[PDB]
Design a protein around this motif. Sequence first.
Motif, PDB file in Angstrom:
ATOM      1  N   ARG A 135     -83.984 -10.636 -58.319  1.00 33.68           N
ATOM      2  CA  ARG A 135     -84.388 -11.284 -59.563  1.00 33.68           C
ATOM      3  C   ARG A 135     -84.150 -10.385 -60.769  1.00 33.68           C
ATOM      4  O   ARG A 135     -83.843 -10.863 -61.868  1.00 33.68           O
ATOM      5  CB  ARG A 135     -85.860 -11.696 -59.504  1.00 33.68           C
ATOM      6  CG  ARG A 135     -86.319 -12.560 -60.678  1.00 33.68           C
ATOM      7  CD  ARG A 135     -87.781 -12.985 -60.554  1.00 33.68           C
ATOM      8  NE  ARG A 135     -88.113 -13.997 -61.556  1.00 33.68           N
ATOM      9  CZ  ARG A 135     -89.305 -14.173 -62.119  1.00 33.68           C
ATOM     10  NH1 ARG A 135     -90.331 -13.406 -61.794  1.00 33.68           N
ATOM     11  NH2 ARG A 135     -89.460 -15.105 -63.049  1.00 33.68           N
ATOM     12  N   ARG A 190    -102.341 -24.557 -62.413  1.00 36.18           N
ATOM     13  CA  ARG A 190    -102.299 -23.283 -61.688  1.00 36.18           C
ATOM     14  C   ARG A 190    -103.006 -22.127 -62.384  1.00 36.18           C
ATOM     15  O   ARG A 190    -103.412 -21.168 -61.736  1.00 36.18           O
ATOM     16  CB  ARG A 190    -100.859 -22.873 -61.340  1.00 36.18           C
ATOM     17  CG  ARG A 190    -100.013 -22.435 -62.525  1.00 36.18           C
ATOM     18  CD  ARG A 190     -98.572 -22.137 -62.109  1.00 36.18           C
ATOM     19  NE  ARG A 190     -98.424 -20.886 -61.363  1.00 36.18           N
ATOM     20  CZ  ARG A 190     -98.281 -20.816 -60.044  1.00 36.18           C
ATOM     21  NH1 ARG A 190     -98.273 -21.925 -59.316  1.00 36.18           N
ATOM     22  NH2 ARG A 190     -98.124 -19.641 -59.453  1.00 36.18           N
ATOM     23  N   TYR A 250     -85.386 -20.931 -59.354  1.00 38.03           N
ATOM     24  CA  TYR A 250     -86.611 -21.676 -59.630  1.00 38.03           C
ATOM     25  C   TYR A 250     -87.097 -21.529 -61.069  1.00 38.03           C
ATOM     26  O   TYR A 250     -87.157 -20.421 -61.591  1.00 38.03           O
ATOM     27  CB  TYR A 250     -87.694 -21.184 -58.663  1.00 38.03           C
ATOM     28  CG  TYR A 250     -89.001 -21.928 -58.717  1.00 38.03           C
ATOM     29  CD1 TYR A 250     -89.197 -23.081 -57.955  1.00 38.03           C
ATOM     30  CD2 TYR A 250     -90.057 -21.464 -59.499  1.00 38.03           C
ATOM     31  CE1 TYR A 250     -90.415 -23.751 -57.969  1.00 38.03           C
ATOM     32  CE2 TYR A 250     -91.281 -22.127 -59.522  1.00 38.03           C
ATOM     33  CZ  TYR A 250     -91.454 -23.268 -58.753  1.00 38.03           C
ATOM     34  OH  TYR A 250     -92.670 -23.913 -58.768  1.00 38.03           O
ATOM     35  N   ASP A 279     -94.556  -9.557 -60.385  1.00 35.84           N
ATOM     36  CA  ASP A 279     -93.632  -9.456 -59.272  1.00 35.84           C
ATOM     37  C   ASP A 279     -92.406  -8.596 -59.512  1.00 35.84           C
ATOM     38  O   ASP A 279     -91.885  -8.523 -60.624  1.00 35.84           O
ATOM     39  CB  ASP A 279     -93.175 -10.857 -58.853  1.00 35.84           C
ATOM     40  CG  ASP A 279     -92.316 -11.529 -59.916  1.00 35.84           C
ATOM     41  OD1 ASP A 279     -92.819 -11.770 -61.031  1.00 35.84           O
ATOM     42  OD2 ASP A 279     -91.129 -11.780 -59.647  1.00 35.84           O
ATOM     43  N   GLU A 314     -93.455  -9.997 -49.456  1.00 35.80           N
ATOM     44  CA  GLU A 314     -93.240 -11.439 -49.340  1.00 35.80           C
ATOM     45  C   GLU A 314     -91.727 -11.422 -49.127  1.00 35.80           C
ATOM     46  O   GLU A 314     -90.985 -11.028 -50.031  1.00 35.80           O
ATOM     47  CB  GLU A 314     -93.603 -12.158 -50.643  1.00 35.80           C
ATOM     48  CG  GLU A 314     -95.103 -12.242 -50.938  1.00 35.80           C
ATOM     49  CD  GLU A 314     -95.838 -13.277 -50.090  1.00 35.80           C
ATOM     50  OE1 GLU A 314     -95.387 -14.437 -50.036  1.00 35.80           O
ATOM     51  OE2 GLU A 314     -96.889 -12.946 -49.497  1.00 35.80           O
ATOM     52  N   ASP A 351    -107.409 -24.893 -49.513  1.00 36.68           N
ATOM     53  CA  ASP A 351    -107.037 -25.465 -48.220  1.00 36.68           C
ATOM     54  C   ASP A 351    -107.925 -24.980 -47.069  1.00 36.68           C
ATOM     55  O   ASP A 351    -107.807 -25.453 -45.934  1.00 36.68           O
ATOM     56  CB  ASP A 351    -105.581 -25.128 -47.891  1.00 36.68           C
ATOM     57  CG  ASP A 351    -105.348 -23.635 -47.694  1.00 36.68           C
ATOM     58  OD1 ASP A 351    -105.907 -22.824 -48.456  1.00 36.68           O
ATOM     59  OD2 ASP A 351    -104.591 -23.271 -46.777  1.00 36.68           O
TER      60      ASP A 351
END
Length: 434
Positions: free
Chosen positions: A267, A251, A381, A262, A217, A179
């Motif tokens: 989680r 990806r 997710y 992570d 994050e 981007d």
Amino acid sequence: QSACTLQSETHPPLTWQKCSSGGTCTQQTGSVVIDANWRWTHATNSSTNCYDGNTWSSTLCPDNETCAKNCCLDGAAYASTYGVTTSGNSLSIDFVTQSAQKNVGARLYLMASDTTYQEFTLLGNEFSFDVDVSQLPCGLNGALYFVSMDADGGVSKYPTNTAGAKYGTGYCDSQCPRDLKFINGQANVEGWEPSSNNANTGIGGHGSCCSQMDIWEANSISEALTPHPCTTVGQEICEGDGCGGTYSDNRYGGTCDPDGCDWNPYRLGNTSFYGPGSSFTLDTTKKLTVVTQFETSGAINRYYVQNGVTFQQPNAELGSYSGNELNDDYCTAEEAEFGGSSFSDKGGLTQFKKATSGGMVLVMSLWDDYYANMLWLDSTYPTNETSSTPGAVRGSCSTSSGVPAQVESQSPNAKVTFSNIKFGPIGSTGNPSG
Ligand SMILES: OC[C@H]1O[C@@H](O[C@H]2[C@H](O)[C@@H](O)[C@H](O[C@H]3[C@H](O)[C@@H](O)[C@H](O[C@H]4[C@H](O)[C@@H](O)[C@H](O)O[C@@H]4CO)O[C@@H]3CO)O[C@@H]2CO)[C@H](O)[C@@H](O)[C@@H]1O
Ligand SMILES: OC[C@H]1O[C@@H](O[C@H]2[C@H](O)[C@@H](O)[C@H](O[C@H]3[C@H](O)[C@@H](O)[C@H](O[C@H]4[C@H](O)[C@@H](O)[C@H](O)O[C@@H]4CO)O[C@@H]3CO)O[C@@H]2CO)[C@H](O)[C@@H](O)[C@@H]1O
Ligand SMILES: *[C@@H]1O[C@H](CO)[C@@H](O)[C@H](O)[C@H]1NC(C)=O
Ligand SMILES: [Co+2]
Ligand SMILES: [Co+2]
């Protein structure tokens, strides 16, 4: 790109503490600079935009080289245009700022001088900072992290880029971002595809890869710590879909790990550790201190402080793994339990150590997610999964939360405040500031 001066560029100052093993800390004075993508890009000889909305000038920018030659980046009015302000050791970023146009958040870099980025060697040291995430609802992310960027922003390697760090050039991260409007002293107009949902963005034929230490994050709901390795440690250009990352169809590109190893307490099973109000160990309606330590073994440790009370990263049991240290055993257990092989395929913590052994630039931002609505961070997710699917649930946000247009309309006054940054050898940042 070159630099123009129709608007003066004054970097908001920001002090931080450099601590020593001897028990003292001394103040350092730097400043912050906004990434080039947020700036006005116009013809060097007039006020004519080279990029407007989400498309390039077909005349000023017929190809990447001609575009870089014809175009320049201009200065930024930090407060009025970008809602970025500083005060001593504090930095605040507003979510939506309305001026001549609407602006959403920002991505800023800590500078050593008005023309260079401050580099930090993480291995063997610890990084501490205070953050107020109280004004960050589902869908938002006040991120603080490190990337292996050049201190000059790419100037020495790419002569056609004369703007440099002063104008926030040279960005790269583990998503190998496509981007970016300028990469390696050239524009990214070739192969540019405008975003279907974002009036200001698109995706070009090139991306910019590099190791990324995603220290923070987070929002008021969830928080994650994530190291991302790349086969090539520092900034490196990539071609189209080979870039992988969030901006490509596949990806899993050829150089960086877009997922990372992570660590999100929620989680991992502790749903009572981080959240808004007194029912959580850490109350996100109040400021908190986050400390991340990088021991020489390559493992990562973490602890938090709020109201003077200290809390180590909560213990997690995953597969044969048990503990609170982010190490090889944890990352291997996570891939075994949650699935995937990206992190290990890219070398894991051993490869990641190569990045922390060298210099890395500090990045502070506030953004919403136009690709996945921040669901990977604060919701379930993929959205079709259930709590029975290992690792699916990462937060309590609804799977319908985080639509950019909705959160920008509903929470324009959201913001994040980073403050009291302190860096030094492991065990030193808790000592008195200078
Ligand atoms: O046009 C002549 C006129 O220009 C004025 O300056 C404008 C620029 O024209 C305009 O292109 C520029 O737009 C910025 C905008 O302010 C940012 O909010 C936005 O940031 C985006 C970024 O584009 C994305 O890549 C990133 O992902 O998200 C951020 C956050 O939304 O970026 C655009 C450019 O792409 O804004 C300038 C300032 O208003 C001059 O001020 C005027 O004098 C001239 O006559
Ligand atoms: O340009 C906009 C904005 O970008 C910010 O950078 C963000 C990316 O926008 C964002 O897409 C990316 O999110 C990653 C995340 O880092 C990974 O950890 C996560 O991995 C998931 C995986 O997708 C799942 O399949 C698996 O089950 O779980 C793992 C762990 O959750 O995937 C998402 C999506 O690719 O993160 C980037 C930052 O690290 C910039 O920071 C900001 O400045 C820009 O404005
Ligand atoms: C969550 O972590 C905190 C701090 O480590 C601990 O006191 C608490 O018991 C944990 N709760 C759960 C459900 O694991
Ligand atoms: Co090419
Ligand atoms: Co250890």
